Design a protein around this ligand. Structure first.
Ligand SMILES: [Ca+2]
Ligand SMILES: [Ca+2]
Ligand SMILES: [Zn+2]
Ligand SMILES: [Zn+2]
Length: 163
């Protein structure tokens, strides 16, 4: 499902920056979750993601609580977990995570890798899917992560935008 107006990135080598972290995972564990979330999309498209440690990146990633400057506030534990902006300059592409969640790398609610993988779909121009097996389904569901691969519906979706 592709977003109304089909916003898409014009370049396929995009940068990202992790602006801050969550105390419930090590910094390394957050960096891995994020790296692997991008790689899912990279191996199904021509997109190549490059991390930068400082300065201005295409996709900023941050953990924030409640009001955090973009007029879409987070809501405390549970409920909304994260959100992401469609491709564009500035805030476009960026992905925010609710700092008040329990973030994990386990089956326990909420696996950061899974949530980030979903948000980056939005960052790249995908909408929600109605397929309950799709990563882009609106509601979180745990799936095994140790050798995770994009569900077929999400491959279909990114290929429709980027080939
Ligand atoms: Ca951006
Ligand atoms: Ca929340
Ligand atoms: Zn936000
Ligand atoms: Zn979503």
């Amino acid at each position: 499902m592709l977003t109304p107006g089909n916003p898409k990135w014009e370049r396929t080598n995009l940068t990202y920056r992790i602006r801050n972290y969550t105390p419930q995972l090590s910094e390394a564990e957050v960096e891995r979750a994020i790296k692997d979330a991008f790689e899912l999309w990279s191996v199904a498209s021509p997109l190549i993601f490059t991390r930068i440690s400082q300065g201005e990146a295409d996709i900023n990633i941050a953990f924030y609580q409640r009001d955090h400057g973009d007029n879409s506030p987070f809501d405390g534990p549970n409920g909304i977990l994260a959100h992401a902006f469609q491709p564009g300059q500035g805030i476009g592409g960026d992905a925010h995570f609710d700092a008040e969640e329990t973030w994990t790398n386990t089956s326990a609610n909420y696996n950061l890798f899974l949530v980030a993988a979903h948000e980056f779909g939005h960052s790249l121009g995908l909408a929600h899917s109605s397929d309950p097996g799709a990563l882009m389904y609106p509601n979180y569901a745990f799936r095994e992560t140790s050798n995770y691969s994009l569900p077929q519906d999400d491959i279909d979706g990114i290929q429709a935008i980027y080939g």
